[PDB]
């Protein structure tokens, strides 16, 4: 495959309904539709969302933070929606992307307002800012920002 | 000084009235006292709420990113309040840290909820976490944390 691997980020435990346990099956659409995007071409996916059953099955915090910081570091580039409101923990994933100079991946909603230490890495880290309004734009122009990311 | 630098770190925008533009007196008196604390060592302090005028002269996004992560690069400790709720920014600054094993206080109001990729770090970055109840506690302990990631 062109690209070899992928850490998937974004909200996780705020999307997890604390009545039901997990996250709703249209916020798991969302990722699983992503995976999907990229297993079908053979490119290894990692995400947090699908490795903890949706929010059944957390890790503690001292795993989930080896793990995924083992995983992003692994993955050829990073793509993450940093969520609205913010996720606290990909944006923590957002600075150790960042700061380690990886290809990333950022998923925006149009019309809505983000962080300045995120919007702002645009052009001054190797990032790409994807803004999109529904799930099917973003399937149709990912790979071009991935594309993009990773050639430099 | 023990400490030459520190970075300090904190909730911004979401301690900002919109009604009156700027930070209360009360959240600006956290900060300025922690900032005193070490400046009255001839401690170097950087740190974003006093630099923006706690708010009424915000900097550009790219502006912000970029005085932000050399500020914490430049310090020999990074101090930071997460955030209940989570500070976006802080989020990745912590990223920006512990990604790059710059020492870190972090400063966790006792018995609230943080993010895994926060208490997570602990014993696997070089971090401390000092949960508190009041700015006095802050104050009186801080300097244990500081010297302990510093002597790692």
Same mark, same amino acid.
């Given at each position: 495959?062109?690209?070899?691997? @992928?850490?998937?980020?974004?909200?996780?435990?705020?999307?997890? /309904?604390?009545?039901? =346990?997990?996250?709703?099956? =249209?916020?798991?659409? $969302?990722?699983?539709?992503?995976?999907?995007?990229?297993?079908?071409?053979? !490119? !290894?996916?990692?995400?947090?969302?699908?490795?903890?059953?949706?929010?059944?099955?957390?890790?503690? &915090?001292?795993?989930?933070?080896?793990? /995924?910081?083992?995983?992003?570091?692994?993955?050829? @580039?990073? $793509?993450?929606?940093?969520?609205?409101?913010?996720? &606290?923990?990909?944006? @923590?994933?957002?600075?150790?992307?960042?700061?380690?100079?990886?290809?990333?991946?950022?998923?925006? %909603?149009?019309?809505? /307002?983000?962080?300045?230490?995120?919007?702002?890495?645009?052009?001054?880290?190797? $990032? %790409?800012?994807?803004?999109?309004?529904? !799930?099917? %734009?973003?399937?149709?122009?990912?790979?071009?920002?991935?594309?993009?990311?990773?050639?430099?």
């Amino acid at each position: 495959p062109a690209v070899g691997s @992928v850490f998937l980020g974004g909200p996780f435990r705020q999307l997890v /309904d604390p009545r039901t =346990g997990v996250m709703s099956s =249209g916020d798991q659409n $969302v990722f699983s539709r992503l995976i999907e995007h990229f297993e079908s071409r053979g !490119t !290894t996916v990692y995400n947090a969302h699908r490795r903890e059953a949706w929010g059944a099955e957390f890790l503690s &915090p001292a795993e989930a933070t080896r793990l /995924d910081h083992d995983e992003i570091k692994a993955a050829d @580039v990073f $793509v993450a929606f940093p969520g609205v409101p913010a996720s &606290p923990g990909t944006h @923590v994933e957002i600075g150790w992307a960042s700061g380690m100079g990886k290809p990333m991946v950022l998923l925006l %909603e149009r019309d809505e /307002d983000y962080a300045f230490l995120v919007t702002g890495l645009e052009s001054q880290a190797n $990032v %790409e800012i994807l803004r999109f309004s529904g !799930t099917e %734009e973003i399937v149709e122009r990912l790979d071009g920002a991935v594309a993009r990311v990773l050639g430099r």
